[PDB]
Design a protein. Sequence first.
Length: 206
Amino acid sequence: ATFEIVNRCSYTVWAAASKGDAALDAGGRQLNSGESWTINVEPGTNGGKIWARTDCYFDDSGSGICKTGDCGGLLRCKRFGRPPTTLAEFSLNQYGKDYIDISNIKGFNVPMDFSPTTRGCRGVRCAADIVGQCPAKLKAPGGGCNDACTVFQTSEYCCTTGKCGPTEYSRFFKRLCPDAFSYVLDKPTTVTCPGSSNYRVTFCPT
């Protein structure tokens, strides 16, 4: 499957793509404002994620640090990134269907649209000013708005027991972005697409 990753933000981002235990395609790349990066994701990929990283510095070897979404200091991510990260999530070719969603379960750093470029389903978007409106206790110094599990590490926020409800913090994310997951047991906003669809992820779509 083909994913076109487009940076419409006025600032540079370092896109990342991983399935948790391996990179997808090159795993990461700098995107200046307006740039597009096309990656190929193997059919059958389960649990892939794409995210943006902000305020990164990398040396020649591709090692460094980012203020949001850092994946162990690497430009080419092999593992998932440190919150806060708005997440585009996907599982492809699962019994004939693709499943896509946007998630704020690991916080929010950059607004995002995640849409198919082929026919048969709708896209999803979280483009509100979550960082500007972020509750004081969730604000991350490097930038972004953390989720409550990252900040407080309780069974309720992290849904450790498999039973948890919405919270004051999850409801904040849900009010600004209804079509994104706001906590682990949120009513799913996953979109079902035909298997082998292609997609575009746009940072700062508005």
